[PDB]
Structure formats: C-alpha cells, structure tokens
Amino acid sequence: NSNVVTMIRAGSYPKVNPTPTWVRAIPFEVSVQSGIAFKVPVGSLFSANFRTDSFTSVTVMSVRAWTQLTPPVNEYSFVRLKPLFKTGDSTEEFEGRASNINTRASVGYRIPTNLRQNTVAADNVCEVRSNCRQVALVISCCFN
Amino acid sequence: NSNVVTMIRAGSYPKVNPTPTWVRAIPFEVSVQSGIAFKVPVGSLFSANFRTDSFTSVTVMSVRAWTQLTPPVNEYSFVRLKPLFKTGDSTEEFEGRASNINTRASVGYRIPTNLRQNTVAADNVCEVRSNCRQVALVISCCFN
Amino acid sequence: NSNVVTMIRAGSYPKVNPTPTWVRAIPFEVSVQSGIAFKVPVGSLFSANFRTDSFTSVTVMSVRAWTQLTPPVNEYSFVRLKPLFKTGDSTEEFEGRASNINTRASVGYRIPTNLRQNTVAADNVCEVRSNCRQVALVISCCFN
Amino acid sequence: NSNVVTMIRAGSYPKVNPTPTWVRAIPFEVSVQSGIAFKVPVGSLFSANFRTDSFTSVTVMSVRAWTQLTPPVNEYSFVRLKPLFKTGDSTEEFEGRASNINTRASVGYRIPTNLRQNTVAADNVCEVRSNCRQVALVISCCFN
Amino acid sequence: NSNVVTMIRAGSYPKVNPTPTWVRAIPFEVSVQSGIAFKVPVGSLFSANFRTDSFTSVTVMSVRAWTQLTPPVNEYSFVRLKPLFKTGDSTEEFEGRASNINTRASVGYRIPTNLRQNTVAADNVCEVRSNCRQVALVISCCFN
Amino acid sequence: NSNVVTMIRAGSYPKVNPTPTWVRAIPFEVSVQSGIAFKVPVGSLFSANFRTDSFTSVTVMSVRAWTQLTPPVNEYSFVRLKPLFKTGDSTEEFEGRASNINTRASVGYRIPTNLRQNTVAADNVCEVRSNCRQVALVISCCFN
Amino acid sequence: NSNVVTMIRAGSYPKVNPTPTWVRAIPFEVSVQSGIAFKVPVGSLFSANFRTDSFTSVTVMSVRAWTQLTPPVNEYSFVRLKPLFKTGDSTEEFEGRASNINTRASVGYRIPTNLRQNTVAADNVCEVRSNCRQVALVISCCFN
RNA sequence: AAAAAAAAAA
RNA sequence: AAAAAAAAAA
RNA sequence: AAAAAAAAAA
RNA sequence: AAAAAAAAAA
RNA sequence: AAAAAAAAAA
RNA sequence: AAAAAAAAAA
RNA sequence: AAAAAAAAAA
RNA sequence: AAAAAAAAAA
RNA sequence: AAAAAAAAAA
RNA sequence: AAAAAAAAAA
RNA sequence: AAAAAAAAAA
RNA sequence: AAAAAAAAAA
RNA sequence: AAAAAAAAAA
RNA sequence: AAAAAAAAAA
Ligand SMILES: [Mg+2]
Ligand SMILES: [Mg+2]
Ligand code: NA
Ligand code: NA
Ligand code: NA
Ligand code: NA
Ligand code: NA
Ligand code: NA
Ligand code: NA
Ligand code: NA
C-alpha cells in the first residue's frame, strides 16, 4: 500500500449531512423496589455519557435486562419486562430467573417493525420488576 | 414478519461501551484570503453541530475541498491543499481548477495508513489556498 | 408411542411469560341505522366473551363485515367500511352488495404493516354503513 | 409491500368461535414442607394472572419443576414429582438434585397421549417433594 | 382487434369503492427566508390543484427539494431538509449544494416503512432551509 | 430494511404533472321506468363523490350493469344496454336476465379501441332498459 | 400500425352478394296455457326486431327453452319441447324441471344434419308445454 | 382449441 | 401471469 | 404449501 | 427442521 | 455469512 | 444409533 | 426387523 | 512477475 | 489493464 | 460488489 | 426488469 | 434494431 | 425481405 | 394459415 499522501480527483460537491443517525446499544441502570414496577424513561437514552445529547428522538428496536445487584436471602434473582407504547401499553411480562443464586437473571424483548416509531424524553420504554434493587438495561436503538 | 413484541432469551451480561467510535464525513467551511495559506484547525471537527463535541481525538483519513464562493472577475476558481502532519509537514500542493467560471474548483488527498494517527483540537489538518474567499471542506475521519 | 409417564431431563429455569400475546379472529355484531355511519369501538374486542378481558391493547390486521339482518323491501343488502386511524382517518368506502335478496352482503379491508400499531378501548376501528339494521364483523387481530 | 388499506373480497360468513382453545406454558410456585408431599391443584392453572379465568378445563401435557428457594445448610437441593391421575395415581417419584449447592434442582415428566384427558379445578396434577420451601412449576397444557 | 362493441358476460355485482387511494408525486413551492427554517404543512398536499381535495389524510413516502430561485450574489445555492414526525422530530439536516452558480441545489430523504403513518392538514412534513427565497418540493405519497 | 430516514441523492428537477390521468371503476345507480330507455349521462362520472370533479373529460372502456331493485311480481329481472356514440349510436341491445327471481340480472359491453375517444358531461354513454326501477352501473374508464 | 389512409391495389371486380346468409341466436317469448301445447311459429323468427325481416326462410339448428314467469303455488317450474317437422312430427317430450322454486326450468334439443332443411313463416318449430304462463326461447339458426 | 356463416389477409 | 394509468427503482 | 402468534422438539 | 393450538393465505 | 445505520470504493 | 432386561409384533 | 417400558452407551 | 510513487493510455 | 521513469522484491 | 466503524443475527 | 396503488384479464 | 408514411426491389 | 427519403424509438 | 364479427363447442 501507499506510504505517502496521494491526490483524490474530487468532482462536484456531494450531498452532506452534519447530523446523521446512529444505531446503538446503550447500557444504563435503573433502581427497582420490591413489588413495584419502575417505568423506564426514554430520556435516559439522551446523554453526553452516551454521546447522544444532540438527539431528541430515538427508535427503540429491542430491550434486554439483567439484575445488577444480589437478590434477597434464600432467593434466586428474577427480572420482568412489560413493554409500553404510546398507542397502547402491552400486558406481557417477559421474565427471566437465575438458576444459581450468585448469577444474574436476564430477559429481553424485540419490538416488531410495525411498532418501531420514534419516542422522545417524556415517553417510557417499559416497566421493570425485580427482587433485586438495581437492573442493568442494554437498549438497541436508532438515534435520529 | 411478527406484528407483536416477542421474547428474547438473553444470556450473560455482554461487553458494553457507552462511548463508541464513529466514522464520519464532516462538512464545514473556512475563510481564505488572496495569496495566503489558511491552516485548517482539527478543532473544527469537534462540535455539537456535528454531534462530535464528546470526542477529543480524531483520525483523519481523507480531505476534499471545493471553492464555496465565486472567483474574481475574469478568473476560473482554483483550490490547493497542502497536507500537514505533526511528524513533518508535506510540501505537496494538490490543486484543482474550474473549467467553467460558474463552477466550483475541487481537489482532495488521501492520508496513507502509516500516517493515520490521532489529532487533537490544537493540531492542523492542512493548508488551503484559493482565489475564492471561502472553501468548503468534507473530511472523512474516525472519531475516537 | 409411550403408554406411561416418562421422565423429562429438565435443565435450567426457562424464560417465562404468564401473560402472552394472542392472534385471534373475533366475531361480534353492531347495530346500524339507515343513512348513518356507525363508529365501531375497539373496546368491543376486549371481553370475557372472547377470553380477552385481560388485554387493554390490540393490533388490528384486517376487518371483514357481513350484513346480519335482511334488507328493506325490494332491496339487495349492502355494507360499507371506512377505515379509521388515530394518525388520520381514511375516506375509502369499501363496499359489497348482495346479488340475491336473501343473501348477505360482505366486504373487508386489510391494514398495511406500516399502519399496524396498537389501539385501546376508546379508539375506533372503522365506520360501518348498511341498509340492514345489524352488521356482523370478524376482526383479525393481535392481542398484546 | 402495500402502504395503504386495500380491499378484501370477502365471501360467505365463515365458521367462527369466540372462545377458542389455547396451548400454554404456565409458570407458578407452590409452598413445600420438609418431609411432606404437596398436592398441586389444577385450579391454580385458571387465573386472570394467566389470562385463563374463562376456562373450566385443561389437558396437561407435561410438568417441569425447579426448586425456588435455597436448600438447608450443608445440603444440595432436590425436587421430586409424583404424577396423579383421576383413573389411578402413579407411584413414580421422578427426582432431580443439584450438583452445586447454589443451583436449582429440576425434573419433569411427560403425560402419554392415552392419559391426556381433561382436568378441572377440583383435581390435582402431581405431588411435589423438596428440601426447599418453594418449588417453581412450568406446566405445558392445552386450555379448552 | 375488434372494431365493434362486444358483449361482456357479467356475473355477480363486484366489490366496489367510489373513493379509492392514490399514489402520487405532488409538486409545489414554498417561500424560504435567510437563516430561518420553514415548516412545510401537510395541508399543502390537499388541493383541487392536485385533484386531492377529497382526501383528508396522506402517507408520505419520500420528499425531494430543489432551489427554485437564484442564490445571493457570489454564492452557490443550497437546500436542507429536516424530517419532522408526530412521534418525534429528527435532527438530520440532509443537504445539497449546487456546483454551478446557475444551477439548482437539490436533496431528498426517504421515510422508512416503520415511520409511514398518516398525516393530516395540521401536521408538518419537514423543515426547509435555503439561501434561495423559494424551494420546489416533489413529495411522493399515498393519499387515502 | 431501514428503520431510519435516509438521504436521497436527487438530481435535476424532474418532469412533473400536478393533474394526472386516472384509470377507474366508477359505481353509480340510475332510475329506470317500465318500457322506457334511460339515457345515462357522462356527467354522472364527474363528482366529488368519486374524487373526479376536477376532470372535464373521460374515455370509457367498458360498461357493466346490474338490476338494483326487485322485479315485478311473477317475473325474472332483465337489463339491456344500447351503446351510444357521438359519431353514431349503436342499435345493439345487449341483455342479461336472472334465472332466479331473487337474483340480479347483469350484462356489459366493451368499447373497441377505435371508438375510445373522450366524452364530456353533456354526452351520454348508453341507454338502459329494465323491468326493475333501478339499475347499478360500474363503468371502467380513464379520466383525463 | 398505420395512422393514415393507404392505397389498396385492387384488381378485377370480385364476386359479390348484397343479401347474404346469417347465423344467429334469436331470443323471443311465447305464451303458454296450463295443460295445453303451444305450437311455436317459424314466422316469429322473421322480424325487424331481429334485423331478419328481409329473409323468408331459415334453417333451424337447435332450440333451447326456459320458463319466463314463476310457477303455480307449491310447484317447481317445468318446460317440455316436442320437435315438429314438415316430413313427420316427433313424439319426444324433452323436459327440464327446476330444483329451486325460484329458478327457471330449462331444456333444449338439437336437430340432426339430415333434418336441417328450410322452414318458412307458416311452418312450426316445436310444441312447448309448461306450468308457467310464458316460455323464453333461444333458437340457433341460419337465415338464408 | 376446433368447426360453420359474413368479412379481411399472406 | 400478461397489459394500461399514477409512483418508485436497478 | 408458505408466513405470524402460544407451546413442544432433534 | 418437524408436529400441535389460534390466524392468515395460494 | 446475511441484514440495518455512518463512511469509503470499482 | 448400537447392546442388555420385561412386553408386544410381521 | 420395527415400536413401547427400565438400563447402558457413542 | 507482483507492489508503491511520478507520468501516460484504452 | 498495458508501457515509461525512481524504488522495492521472489 | 468488496472493505472499515456502531448494531443485530444463524 | 422488479415492487406498490387504481383498473382490466386468462 | 424494430414500427409508420412516400419510393424502389427480389 | 433488402435499400433510400420524412418520422418515431430501445 | 392467421385476425375480426355472429354462432356453436370441449
Ligand atoms: Mg339460491
Ligand atoms: Mg458456578
Ligand atoms: Na454529545
Ligand atoms: Na453532541
Ligand atoms: Na376471561
Ligand atoms: Na376475567
Ligand atoms: Na382474563
Ligand atoms: Na378535485
Ligand atoms: Na374531489
Ligand atoms: Na332489417
């Protein structure tokens, strides 16, 4: 290969876009209480911490969740996810449980193409339930 | 295809990175004076305007340039690029000229793999010369 | 095949969901007046009568309609459907007529993938018009 | 694919059924005492919690069980299942044990086709024994 | 081929629809100011001028834009499009520029299937920016 | 497929037409008297009710007719069509009869290419005769 | 194909015939009384109503008949045909009956080649019997 | 797709 | 499955 | 026979 | 990849 | 190995 | 998929 | 030689 | 014979 | 893809 | 059509 | 040449 | 390369 | 079926 | 032998 700078025979000025879309897997944590659903805000996906503070909308594709702290004494970890949508919330409670008390529980869900519209900060993605006090989410999404 | 949310059988917690790299084509303009080289600052590539203000380093791959305003009376536009590097500046002056007085001049250069290291805001990419008072750059680069 | 109970060598606790989705064809009737459109409520789809009272959202895929009582004297039955959507109602009036005075008129429409989002009880599916005083609907849908 | 509503050329009124059957995997927990068999009631399978309160009968295909709390000090978990049938109970004691003290024990059994009749709320499915104070069941069944 | 009228052996009365959908490419112009975004109203698509005044909804598929008057002295034309959506506006600024001062700038964007829902008159399609005082749009859409 | 907006690399301004042609099947009814031919006006094809009020001309391709009310006591329905043309009316009487007293009679005719010129509101399409007091027409045509 | 008038290189004067033969299916009705045979006159085939008044002879090929009004109360329609010939009448009584009280009875017969000679107005085709007061005939014939 | 009648054609 | 009209596309 | 949803399986 | 249940389809 | 997004290329 | 034990079978 | 039940196995 | 740099070419 | 100039190489 | 980056997948 | 919408058709 | 119009031709 | 003139076209 | 119109037909 070349070891020196070389000319490019540029043509006409191209189509450009200073502010493109970005497909991402975004990791963050939420706090969860015993017996109580936590509504996960879409606003958590927009942050300098993820290089996403310039976006104000996102299309979520899938949500995965893991318990992030240990469960109560004698118990195995569990985590549940209930999808939420502006056009009508679901009542599914997708659940994983650990089979070793020292191991994370995990579960996820995929949003079908027909429900992949945009969401903004004030929207919620899902409800999380767990016997652990924190849950770690990884959300696959398209910032736009 | 599915019209409903469906379960994902998530496993162990994955490797994650909240602050990934990003390959980009960044468009911006510089002002140019008659007979004078303008040193293009790398700092212009880091901006909320490009969603890149969270980066402090970038690896430039190629630089393309177009004249952005009309040339002086009786003249055809030209633009020249001289690559700059922290380990030693080049003396190449890659040049394009217009063949229609109403048309942009354009030129570019490719940086070879052996010279693709990082640059930071206080570094310069290249010198630009032109008979036009503004030049439009599109820089292909890897933010990291 | 086996005539006795046999062991299953179960492994780890599986992903579970006590409240799954359900794809359905739901039959119900609506009352219709001469010259007047009836807005069919989505709420009619959630009922112990269909085993669906535990759902609060549904994604409608298609709607079929039949006249359910006889037409006025000297007339053949007709039925019309006009699709309604939260993002903008249609002005199509899909229509079937009977060709025997003793026979039901029927028609349907399919909702395209891009318009398959959720609806809730307060939403409406379509407008129905007919010269018959009842219309029988079968709605293909995905409870979630 | 289509982006708009389209006509369906419906024919005669179809065979319909507002209250269909449903094949399911139903997850629930039972309490278990040291040295004592717990009889698992079929009635637990009919609940708003599983969207199954409209059913009166169910045909069980298989039963799987996991210990759901930790075992006594110094011990590995175990779980046993004894199938019960209205025409004559079994005396099999299908058993799984854990091989790591921190891990669930599990086991299951399949009901052969010749014994897949209906059961109702009054009936029992099986006896459960364990050294753990709760057992998690997942029962594969056909509600009808 | 036949030079005379011939009989058609018609059967039963067909499904009919007096008010069908229509796929279209709609051309219209908007006024644009220096430094200021113009929100393009969906209402502009419904007009006797396009034979579309009987519709009240439309599904937009793509948007293309051209500058429609000359640019300021010394400049090349440019046009930018920012997609807008009821579920969350984008922050993309898709841009084209002219490479001859006497030529139109152009650019477009495609709306993905998952974002193709209906819009009505009070909704907006996109924001337009330009250095030219008028922009000509051609919008590909499905009236329904 | 893409889940986000994407750029279109538009070129020059295309040929456009804000008022295109439209191929249609137009359903409407006419009143018919015993023993008397009804001249069907072309003007009935231009209406807001069909989204066609912006047109001044139409090219008719074929005409189909069904009786639309019941026949007199003891009789089977019949319908006849006689094609009319500005260059010379036909004397054909294409006829269908019902073979069940409760069923519609139907018939149609095709216009050959050599006779497919435009017609305007003032013109007539055909004469209709029937023993029923209304006839339902579906006219296949090209609005231009 | 050609869009203009073109010369034909005509030769000698051809054989001509101002008054050709014509193969036809002629529809007409006859009145019928209970228990009485109606002799169908060949003369009915020659009429301005069929464009056949310039003919004085016809060769009949086949005869089909349908009841044309409803039958008496409690009855199904029937129609019978007895072929008549100048060289000797038949005694066949070809018969059709309806299987739905609302439907026409129908039947026909074919005349063999050896019996296809001419008939004139004063000749009869066949005898018709029915329980209905009118019978519709369609006669396939060669006017000459 | 084959036949008959009127027409047109290589 | 072929054709026409409106659109989109390599 | 192919697709979707719930389940079951190599 | 095969089977069962609900649906949809050539 | 196939798909999507940003870039680059024959 | 092959073997052993109990059963059933062409 | 094929199936079922208990076991054993690549 | 293949690669890189400057040039030239279908 | 082929040739020339500088270089590098099996 | 091939490569790189972010994601998703058998 | 392939897809979508309206129509027409074997 | 195929079609139409005028001409010419085996 | 080939050529020329006017036109239309992939 | 192919097409059009009326008819008849598998
Ligand atoms: Mg009937
Ligand atoms: Mg371990
Ligand atoms: Na940022
Ligand atoms: Na930023
Ligand atoms: Na219920
Ligand atoms: Na209930
Ligand atoms: Na319920
Ligand atoms: Na109009
Ligand atoms: Na209109
Ligand atoms: Na006459």
Swiss-Prot record, chains A, B, C, D, E, F, G:
Record-linked Gene3D superfamilies: Satellite virus coat domain
Protein's UniProt keywords contain Cytoplasm: no
UniProtKB keywords: Capsid protein, Virion
Main subcellular localisation: virion
A single Gene Ontology CC term: viral capsid
Localization annotation: Virion
Keyword Oxidoreductase: no
Gene Ontology molecular function terms on file: structural molecule activity
Domain of life of the source: Viruses
Miscellaneous comment in the UniProt entry for this protein: This virus depends on tobacco mosaic virus for its replication.
Protein name: Coat protein
